[PDB]
């Protein structure tokens, strides 16, 4: 049973604005969703200091990419307090219509698509490298779903059946033809140590066979 929703006009447009752009410096999408992750796990970190219980589902707090070059993906795991339902239907746990507003104005007024995050909408730099973008989610108070975009204005919810991750947020990025530069090891380590080298979480770069 999958739901299929329409994206609200404002993000649409953040979203082709993203897509079409010509804009070189596509490798902040990994500093944005690290940042992502980072106050995620702050989050569930700030709620077990005065209950410990909130860790049951999982007491390792960390960060794991994972290139895949035969799936031609690469995915972003933590372990942070993860999305209800209500909270991917609302924009992925964003306020993503006033910052998209924000962000837009910035544009026309000096900035450029790097700066994104301060926008709270840096989720959405992801489809600067993806055609599509695959989230999992677990949060203590929901069951564990799976949303999904390929733009073009419409996303999707279902149940997720797969393999159960105990507390956090899982993005997939299925990556575009010509951006598989981001699934190679020293291409992720570069990006990681320039942009992400002061998060307080330990983050592992899986290797392939
Ligand atoms: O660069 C501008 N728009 C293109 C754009 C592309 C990506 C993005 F995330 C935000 C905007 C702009 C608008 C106003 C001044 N500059």
């Known amino acids: 049973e999958v739901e299929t929703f329409a994206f609200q006009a404002e993000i649409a447009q953040l979203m082709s604005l993203i897509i079409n752009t010509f804009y070189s410096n596509k490798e902040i999408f990994l500093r944005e969703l690290i940042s992502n992750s980072s106050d995620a796990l702050d989050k569930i970190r700030y709620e077990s200091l005065t209950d410990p219980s909130k860790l049951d589902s999982g007491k390792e707090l960390h960060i794991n990419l994972i290139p895949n070059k035969q799936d031609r993906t690469l995915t972003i795991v933590d372990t942070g307090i993860g999305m209800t339902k209500a909270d991917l239907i609302n924009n992925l746990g964003t306020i993503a219509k006033s910052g998209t507003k924000a962000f837009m104005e910035a544009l026309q007024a000096g900035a450029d698509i790097s700066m994104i995050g301060q926008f709270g909408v840096g989720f959405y730099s992801a489809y600067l490298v993806a055609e599509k973008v695959t989230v999992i989610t677990k949060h203590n108070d929901d069951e564990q779903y799976a949303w999904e975009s390929s ?21 997939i990025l299925h990556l575009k033809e010509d951006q598989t530069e981001y699934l190679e090891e020293r291409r992720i380590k570069e990006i990681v140590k320039k942009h992400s080298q002061f998060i307080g979480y330990p983050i592992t770069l899986f290797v392939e066979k």
Do not use: I, L, N, Q
């Open 151 to 171: 733009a073009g204005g419409s996303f999707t919810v279902r149940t997720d059946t797969g393999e159960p991750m105990g507390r956090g947020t899982k993005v």
